[PDB]
Amino acid sequence: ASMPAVERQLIECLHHVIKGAEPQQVGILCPQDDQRKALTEQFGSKTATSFCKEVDSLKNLSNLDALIVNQALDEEINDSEKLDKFITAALRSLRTDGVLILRQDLSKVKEMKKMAMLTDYFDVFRLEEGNGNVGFQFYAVNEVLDSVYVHQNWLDFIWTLMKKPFPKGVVSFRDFLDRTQYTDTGIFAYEWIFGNNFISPGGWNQNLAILKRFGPMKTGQRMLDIGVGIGGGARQAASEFGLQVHGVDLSTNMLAVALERVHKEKDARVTYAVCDACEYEFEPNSFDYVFSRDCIQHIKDTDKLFSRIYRALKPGGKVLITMYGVGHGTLSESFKEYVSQRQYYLKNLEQIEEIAKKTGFIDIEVENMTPRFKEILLEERERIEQDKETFLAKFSQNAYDGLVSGWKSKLQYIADDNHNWNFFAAVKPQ
Numbered sequence: 542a543s544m545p546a547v548e549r550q551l552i553e554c555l556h557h558v559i560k561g562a563e564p565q566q567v568g569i570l571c572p573q574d575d576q577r578k579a580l581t582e583q584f585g586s587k588t589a590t591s592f593c594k595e596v597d598s599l600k601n602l603s604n605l606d607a608l609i610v611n612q613a614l615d616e617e618i619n620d621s622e623k624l625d626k627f628i629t630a631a632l633r634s635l636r637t638d639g640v641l642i643l644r645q646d647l648s649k650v651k652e653m654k655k656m657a658m659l660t661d662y663f664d665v666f667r668l669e670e671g672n673g674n675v676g677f678q679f680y681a682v683n684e685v686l687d688s689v690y691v692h693q694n695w696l697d698f699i700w701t702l703m704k705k706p707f708p709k710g711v712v713s714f715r716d717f718l719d720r721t722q723y724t725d726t727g728i729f730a731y732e733w734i735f736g737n738n739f740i741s742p743g744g745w746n747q748n749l750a751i752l753k754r755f756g757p758m759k760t761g762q763r764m765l766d767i768g769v770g771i772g773g774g775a776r777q778a779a780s781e782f783g784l785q786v787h788g789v790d791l792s793t794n795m796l797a798v799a800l801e802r803v804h805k806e807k808d809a810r811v812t813y814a815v816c817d818a819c820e821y822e823f824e825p826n827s828f829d830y831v832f833s834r835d836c837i838q839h840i841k842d843t844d845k846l847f848s849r850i851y852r853a854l855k856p857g858g859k860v861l862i863t864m865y866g867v868g869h870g871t872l873s874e875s876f877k878e879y880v881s882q883r884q885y886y887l888k889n890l891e892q893i894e895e896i897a898k899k900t901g902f903i904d905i906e907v908e909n910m911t912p913r914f915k916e917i918l919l920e921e922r923e924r925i926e927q928d929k930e931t932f933l934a935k936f937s938q939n940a941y942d943g944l945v946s947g948w949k950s951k952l953q954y955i956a957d958d959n960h961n962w963n964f965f966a967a968v969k970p971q
């Protein structure tokens with residue numbers, strides 16, 4: 542039971558990609574006439590639109606700059622053959638670089654991983670076109686905000702995808718995350734050691750201490766959380782400080798859990814989006830705070846990232862980031878192999894400060910929190926060693942041994958001053 546606010550958001554999603562351009566040819570697949578007309582009125586006289594009411598009709602649409610599909614795939618999401626027919630027809634109908642905006646409510650779908658499974662399917666699907674392949678490039682998954690605020694529904698999704706050419710092996714950044722470090726089994730094993738809802742050292746108590754280093758925060762202020770993981774940090778920021786928190790993560794595995802949990806527990810201060818924080822188009826001058834907890838070691842282009850954060854902060858706004866970093870000790874081969882397998886792009890505090898100054902941040906604070914990181918590992922390790930019997934009731938031996946040796950290994954990395962745990966904070970001037 543949606544309102545006109547939804548259709549306006551769909552067009553906003555479209556404009557993240559095409560910007561100020563108006564699309565020459567638009568297709569609309571939308572079975573609900575009132576929702577369909579609200580969409581149509583969003584376009585002006587420079588746009589010609591063809592729309593249809595059943596998915597089989599996409600074969601009749603072509604040379605589209607954009608295809609908007611709204612609540613039309615109820616059957617397809619339960620039938621891979623029908624889904625395949627739609628994706629194929631959708632790709633054929635679009636020009637290269639054409640945008641697909643797909644809105645589908647998943648709240649009546651009992652499978653909680655459905656959004657994640659659909660996203661990989663879209664990301665992986667390939668269609669022969671000419672002497673190569675075509676497919677959809679992933680941009681984002683957003684929540685329909687009307688659905689959150691009016692219907693307490695956090696599982697109403699909008700995918701933003703773009704048609705691109707592909708060769709006829711080569712893994713996207715998102716898939717590396719979902720297939721390697723942040724798998725489901727990895728997530729539940731990680732959550733167990735760090736603490737409920739957290740994938741970062743020290744769990745609830747530690748995250749609260751870090752949030753406090755922002756200084757005074759007020760109810761209703763807006764925070765962007767980069768690399769929100771399974772949501773523990775965002776949810777705590779909202780419940781403890783009354784912040785409105787928007788969390789982003791590139792890993793669908795991670796966010797599936799965050800989304801499931803907020804959808805069940807219900808807190809309208811918290812929303813989530815799947816996207817790459819180095820690329821996604823955030824609204825400028827809009828956030829009071831940007832927070833990132835142990836995320837940015839995954840991110841190569843720190844320079845780009847900082848300019849985007851700066852851009853996104855309100856003047857006078859504050860950024861606070863913690864991250865894995867590299868120390869000033871002689872790097873060991875074990876540490877170097879560890880970094881490559883994780884694909885971390887590590888920096889030291891000096892480099893972070895240089896970049897922050899170059900970006901234009903003021904009041905820069907940096908801290909080496911490695912001694913704290915050490916206390917946490919030791920404390921965490923004493924817990925597992927004590928609760929050995931309880932772990933094997935839930936997970937396998939293989940997950941367990943990797944934890945003991947991993948914890949053993951990080952301790953040596955800290956000892957050699959290879960591995961650091963860094964704190965950075967700063968403010969946007971004015």
Ligand SMILES: C[S@@+](CC[C@H](N)C(=O)[O-])C[C@H]1O[C@@H](n2cnc3c(N)ncnc32)[C@H](O)[C@@H]1O
Pocket residue numbers: 718723738739740741767768769770771772773774789790791792795816817818819833834835836837839840
């Ligand atoms: C070690 S975890 C931290 C989770 C969260 N900070 C917490 O305390 O529970 C890293 C998270 O950052 C996310 N991440 C890595 N690169 C990202 C990117 N380019 N954009 C958005 N999120 C990213 C990963 O998906 C992962 O979920």
